[PDB]
């Protein structure tokens, strides 16, 4: 058609990336996926409701937890209902459905519709009880009432979706490489699975030299035969400086033949990116290897004492334990025992030879018999462990997706990022974890908008990866609806002309300073930009006009804007502003990482009713080193209340901040509760910033709410470039304790740290394989391998609670006894 050549051209800027070039490619994989995800697409699409897709309730079916029972008085909820501008309270068992709320409302009162929130574009509806809409779940948590405005539910329509139509050893020839610029240097090149090297040649060193041939044969000992699906041949050359790679087998199951001509990755400075079948597209500096290939189809008994136990310790052991070649062999020759335990699939499937046919062969013969994994209830720590990148075998994968096929919306959506960020693990851009996303997406638009900007944040900033991405978010566009796609429009048109307000103002740099930023906000907001826009860290809010008054460019090298926006919906029961900032320089990847580890953590806690309070505040990467970030609302830096009645100095007071508190709570009694709010805040990060390692940190990245909650901010700035947590003589003082000495609030401090500590050493597995796959996704540099198994010492594994509860308690002691030593470090760090 016409319009279809245009309507390619919008998704085109959408998607950030043009998906219909070929031009960095030098197979149909890409065309193959982009057609092979036509179906699953169409299929989600013709099998969701359109009602409950459009008002895409926010459901949970996890237990209302105890803490927000004992906020509830008697079964009774109250509901503030608003039509006009008349309200009415009403009474509401937790366990009222929302459909039977107006047979309390079309007959609880005399003398077609559906409930949606006060401000928001968030509705109840749906066969649910109340008392599990997460809304409701967020007004209780922080002691709020429950308006909604009854009015028109939105029509399906708008959604629609537009309309469709040998024995003989495997060898490579290394013709040679060349730069176009530059020592001696030979070419690596290794059939690969799964982070598992089967075989290794070399090349004869050659004069490093804009061109460099060698028209060699590197005979491998391996069988053609023997080549698994997902084997890579991968390509390195030494002096190490550049590596690509290529799939031995392809997406049709052919053996790769052909000349193929390669541009190179570049080191610097492991990690995903090394692991991508993409070339480089940069043909003009990139250096480039070629290569040549030709060569087609492709195809329980008992035990020792002993032995048991030796297998049961291998079982139990957490995910970083390195297996011994003696340990392999035991998991292989008892694979059928092994398989009795969903426990032992993680290092049962490492201990396949994926070499060998004959061996892979008995592999796919144990999956055949996978009732006790089919059976057993999700577990996803380990079922992330099978999408890392220890796994190459589409059967193995595709059993820990089916395993995911059972998360509910809610529960997708605390893994979405890392699920997203484990594609780069897939050997394939057709995958059953790419079309698990798919499909959880197009049925869930709150899924769905996550989904966009976590892949678009993607394709902006990683040319390794953009292509695959580039070719699932397509997929998802052309399912999402019209609505959504009108939407989606709205959204990047407003943040491509912020970051351009960011970035220049960025470059202009103070008293002229501040003329220029509200001169450009005050362009932006004509015919532009649009009314409104859905905030992307919270796609329940619709922003509106920029306040330009209380906008404005902030002190700090790098420059961030503060924008404010009033609510773009009438029916907001207050004015006050949604405040975003908008930044350049850091890498906002590793925050949103960081960041959504702690509502998982958060989560871990929800189970055992406990609230550690965290503020793990909207973020979202938008591209390179830029990015958007929630703003919170009445809240200061720790090391600025230190500046305040001490002054840019260090000379640290430590009464200040329970002052500050007290000088800032309405009563007394509210005052109690920002003391009550705090001891919780502070040990949520104390534990929560100690396991992942990142609890060493600096005055100024440490703040507050003048209602007691703490909250650590810039997690990049460590991570992104580098005492066990901060306990400061500050903190301890709103805990009635000074120097050494005890009281009833630390104390409970204590006891609520051992306890949310100990939560967290429950998910031990989980919490290592999310802080595992976090470092090669998301922390460039940040590798080693040694960086990995911090997070093993931190959560102190294979000792007993009790040597548990005594290390956290002593880590808080060297808290105690370094006062001021290392806050005044970090200050005296000029
Ligand atoms: C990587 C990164 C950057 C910013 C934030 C961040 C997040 C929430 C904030 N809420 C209020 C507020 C903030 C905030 N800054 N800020 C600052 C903190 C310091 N800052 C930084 O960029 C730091 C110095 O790197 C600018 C934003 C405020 O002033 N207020 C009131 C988190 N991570």
């Given at each position: 058609s016409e319009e279809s050549q245009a309507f390619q051209r919008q998704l085109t800027a959408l998607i950030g990336y043009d998906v219909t070039d070929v031009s960095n490619v030098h197979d149909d994989e890409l065309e193959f996926t982009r057609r092979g995800l036509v179906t699953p697409r169409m299929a989600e699409v013709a099998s969701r409701d359109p009602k409950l897709y459009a008002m895409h309730p926010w459901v949970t079916s996890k237990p209302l937890p105890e803490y927000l029972w004992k906020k509830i008085a008697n079964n009774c909820i109250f509901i503030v209902i608003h039509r006009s501008t008349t309200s009415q309270t009403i009474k509401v068992s937790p366990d009222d459905t929302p459909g039977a709320i107006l047979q309390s409302f079309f007959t609880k009162m005399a003398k077609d519709f559906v409930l949606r929130v006060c401000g928001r574009d968030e509705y109840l509806v749906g066969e649910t009880p109340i008392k599990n809409f997460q809304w409701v779940r967020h007004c209780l948590k922080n002691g709020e009432e429950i308006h909604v405005v009854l009015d028109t539910p939105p029509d399906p329509a708008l959604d629609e979706v537009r309309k469709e139509e040998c024995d003989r050893k495997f060898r490579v020839k290394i013709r040679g490489i060349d730069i176009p610029v530059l020592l001696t240097v030979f070419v690596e090149a290794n059939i690969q699975h799964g982070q598992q090297v089967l075989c290794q040649r070399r090349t004869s060193p050659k004069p490093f030299t804009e061109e460099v041939l060698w028209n060699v044969w590197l005979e491998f000992s391996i069988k053609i035969k023997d080549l698994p699906k997902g084997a890579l041949l991968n390509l390195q050359i030494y002096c190490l400086l550049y590596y690509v790679n290529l799939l031995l087998i392809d997406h049709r199951f052919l053996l790769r033949r052909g000349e193929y001509v390669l541009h190179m990755w570049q080191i610097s400075g492991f990690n995903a990116d090394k692991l991508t079948s993409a070339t480089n597209p940069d043909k003009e500096n990139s250096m480039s290897i070629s290569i040549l290939l030709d060569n087609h189809p492709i195809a329980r008994a008992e035990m020792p004492n002993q032995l048991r136990k030796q297998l049961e310790a291998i079982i139990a052991t957490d995910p970083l334990n390195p297996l011994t070649a003696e340990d392999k062999e035991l998991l292989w020759h008892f694979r059928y025992e092994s398989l009795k335990h969903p426990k032992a699939y993680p290092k049962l499937f490492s201990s396949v030879k994926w070499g060998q046919q004959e061996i892979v062969a008995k592999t796919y013969q144990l999956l055949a018999r996978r009732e006790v994994w089919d059976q057993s209830a999700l577990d996803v720590g380990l079922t992330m462990q099978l999408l890392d990148c220890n796994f190459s075998d589409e059967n193995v994968r595709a059993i820990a997706v089916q395993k995911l096929e059972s998360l509910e919306d809610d529960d997708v959506l605390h893994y979405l990022l890392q699920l997203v960020q484990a594609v780069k693990f897939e050997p394939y851009h057709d995958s059953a974890l790419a079309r698990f996303l798919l499909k959880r997406g197009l049925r869930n638009k709150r899924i769905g908008h996550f989904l966009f900007w976590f892949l678009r944040s993607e394709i902006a900033q990683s040319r390794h990866y953009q292509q695959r991405f580039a070719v699932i978010l397509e997929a998802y566009l052309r399912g999402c609806g019209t609505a959504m796609l009108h939407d989606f429009t709205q959204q990047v048109q407003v943040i491509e002309m912020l970051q351009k307000v960011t970035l220049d103002i960025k470059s202009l740099s103070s008293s002229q300073v501040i003329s220029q930023l509200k001169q450009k906000l005050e362009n932006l907001q004509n015919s532009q930009l649009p009314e409104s826009f859905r905030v992307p860290y919270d796609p329940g809010l619709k922003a509106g006009a920029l306040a330009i008054e209380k906008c404005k460019v902030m002190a700090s090298k790098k420059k961030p804007l503060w924008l404010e926006f009033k609510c773009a919906d009438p029916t907001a029961l207050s004015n006050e502003t949604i405040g975003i900032i908008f930044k350049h320089g850091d890498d906002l990847r590793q925050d949103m990482l960081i960041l959504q580890i702690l509502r998982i953590m958060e989560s871990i806690w929800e189970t055992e009713s406990?609230?550690?309070?965290?503020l793990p505040y909207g973020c979202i990467s938008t591209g390179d080193k830029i990015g958007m970030i929630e703003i919170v609302k009445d809240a200061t830096t720790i090391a600025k209340i230190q500046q305040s009645t001490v002054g840019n100095t260090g000379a640290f007071k430590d009464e200040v901040l329970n002052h500050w508190l007290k000088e800032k709570s309405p009563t007394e009694e509210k005052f109690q509760a920002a003391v009550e709010r705090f001891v919780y805040s502070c040990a949520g990060y104390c534990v929560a910033t100690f396991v992942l390692g990142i609890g060493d940190r600096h005055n100024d990245n440490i703040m507050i709410t003048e209602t007691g909650n703490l909250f650590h901010i810039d997690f990049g700035h460590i991570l992104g470039n580098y005492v066990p947590f901060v306990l400061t003589p500050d903190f301890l003082f709103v805990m009635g304790t000074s120097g050494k000495k005890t009281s009833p609030h630390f104390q409970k401090f204590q006891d609520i740290c051992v306890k949310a500590y100990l939560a967290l050493r429950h998910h031990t597995n989980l919490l290592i394989i999310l802080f595992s796959m976090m470092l090669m996704t998301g922390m460039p540099q940040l590798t080693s391998k040694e960086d990995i198994e911090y997070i093993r010492d931190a959560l102190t594994v294979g000792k007993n609670e009790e040597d548990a509860k005594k290390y956290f308690l002593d880590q808080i002691e060297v808290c105690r006894d370094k006062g001021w030593t290392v806050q005044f470090n970090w200050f005296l760090h000029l």
């Amino acid at each position: 058609s016409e319009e279809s050549q245009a309507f390619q051209r919008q998704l085109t800027a959408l998607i950030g990336y043009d998906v219909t070039d070929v031009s960095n490619v030098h197979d149909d994989e890409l065309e193959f996926t982009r057609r092979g995800l036509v179906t699953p697409r169409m299929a989600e699409v013709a099998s969701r409701d359109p009602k409950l897709y459009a008002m895409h309730p926010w459901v949970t079916s996890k237990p209302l937890p105890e803490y927000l029972w004992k906020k509830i008085a008697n079964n009774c909820i109250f509901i503030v209902i608003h039509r006009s501008t008349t309200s009415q309270t009403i009474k509401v068992s937790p366990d009222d459905t929302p459909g039977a709320i107006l047979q309390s409302f079309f007959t609880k009162m005399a003398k077609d519709f559906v409930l949606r929130v006060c401000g928001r574009d968030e509705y109840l509806v749906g066969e649910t009880p109340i008392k599990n809409f997460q809304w409701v779940r967020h007004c209780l948590k922080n002691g709020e009432e429950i308006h909604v405005v009854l009015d028109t539910p939105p029509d399906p329509a708008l959604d629609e979706v537009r309309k469709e139509e040998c024995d003989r050893k495997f060898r490579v020839k290394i013709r040679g490489i060349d730069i176009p610029v530059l020592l001696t240097v030979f070419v690596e090149a290794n059939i690969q699975h799964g982070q598992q090297v089967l075989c290794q040649r070399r090349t004869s060193p050659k004069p490093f030299t804009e061109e460099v041939l060698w028209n060699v044969w590197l005979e491998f000992s391996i069988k053609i035969k023997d080549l698994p699906k997902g084997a890579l041949l991968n390509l390195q050359i030494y002096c190490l400086l550049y590596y690509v790679n290529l799939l031995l087998i392809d997406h049709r199951f052919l053996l790769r033949r052909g000349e193929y001509v390669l541009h190179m990755w570049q080191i610097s400075g492991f990690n995903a990116d090394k692991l991508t079948s993409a070339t480089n597209p940069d043909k003009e500096n990139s250096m480039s290897i070629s290569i040549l290939l030709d060569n087609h189809p492709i195809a329980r008994a008992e035990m020792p004492n002993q032995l048991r136990k030796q297998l049961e310790a291998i079982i139990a052991t957490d995910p970083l334990n390195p297996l011994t070649a003696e340990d392999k062999e035991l998991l292989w020759h008892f694979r059928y025992e092994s398989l009795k335990h969903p426990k032992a699939y993680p290092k049962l499937f490492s201990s396949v030879k994926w070499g060998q046919q004959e061996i892979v062969a008995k592999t796919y013969q144990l999956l055949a018999r996978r009732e006790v994994w089919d059976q057993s209830a999700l577990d996803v720590g380990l079922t992330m462990q099978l999408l890392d990148c220890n796994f190459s075998d589409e059967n193995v994968r595709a059993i820990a997706v089916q395993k995911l096929e059972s998360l509910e919306d809610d529960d997708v959506l605390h893994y979405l990022l890392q699920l997203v960020q484990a594609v780069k693990f897939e050997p394939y851009h057709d995958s059953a974890l790419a079309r698990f996303l798919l499909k959880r997406g197009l049925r869930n638009k709150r899924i769905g908008h996550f989904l966009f900007w976590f892949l678009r944040s993607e394709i902006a900033q990683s040319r390794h990866y953009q292509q695959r991405f580039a070719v699932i978010l397509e997929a998802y566009l052309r399912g999402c609806g019209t609505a959504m796609l009108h939407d989606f429009t709205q959204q990047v048109q407003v943040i491509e002309m912020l970051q351009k307000v960011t970035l220049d103002i960025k470059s202009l740099s103070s008293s002229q300073v501040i003329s220029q930023l509200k001169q450009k906000l005050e362009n932006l907001q004509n015919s532009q930009l649009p009314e409104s826009f859905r905030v992307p860290y919270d796609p329940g809010l619709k922003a509106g006009a920029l306040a330009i008054e209380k906008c404005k460019v902030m002190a700090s090298k790098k420059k961030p804007l503060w924008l404010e926006f009033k609510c773009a919906d009438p029916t907001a029961l207050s004015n006050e502003t949604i405040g975003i900032i908008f930044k350049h320089g850091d890498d906002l990847r590793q925050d949103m990482l960081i960041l959504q580890i702690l509502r998982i953590m958060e989560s871990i806690w929800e189970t055992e009713s406990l609230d550690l309070c965290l503020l793990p505040y909207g973020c979202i990467s938008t591209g390179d080193k830029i990015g958007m970030i929630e703003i919170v609302k009445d809240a200061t830096t720790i090391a600025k209340i230190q500046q305040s009645t001490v002054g840019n100095t260090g000379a640290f007071k430590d009464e200040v901040l329970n002052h500050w508190l007290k000088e800032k709570s309405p009563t007394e009694e509210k005052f109690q509760a920002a003391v009550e709010r705090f001891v919780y805040s502070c040990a949520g990060y104390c534990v929560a910033t100690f396991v992942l390692g990142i609890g060493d940190r600096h005055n100024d990245n440490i703040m507050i709410t003048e209602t007691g909650n703490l909250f650590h901010i810039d997690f990049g700035h460590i991570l992104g470039n580098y005492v066990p947590f901060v306990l400061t003589p500050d903190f301890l003082f709103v805990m009635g304790t000074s120097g050494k000495k005890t009281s009833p609030h630390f104390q409970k401090f204590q006891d609520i740290c051992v306890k949310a500590y100990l939560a967290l050493r429950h998910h031990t597995n989980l919490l290592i394989i999310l802080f595992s796959m976090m470092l090669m996704t998301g922390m460039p540099q940040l590798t080693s391998k040694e960086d990995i198994e911090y997070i093993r010492d931190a959560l102190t594994v294979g000792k007993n609670e009790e040597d548990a509860k005594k290390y956290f308690l002593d880590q808080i002691e060297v808290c105690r006894d370094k006062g001021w030593t290392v806050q005044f470090n970090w200050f005296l760090h000029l």
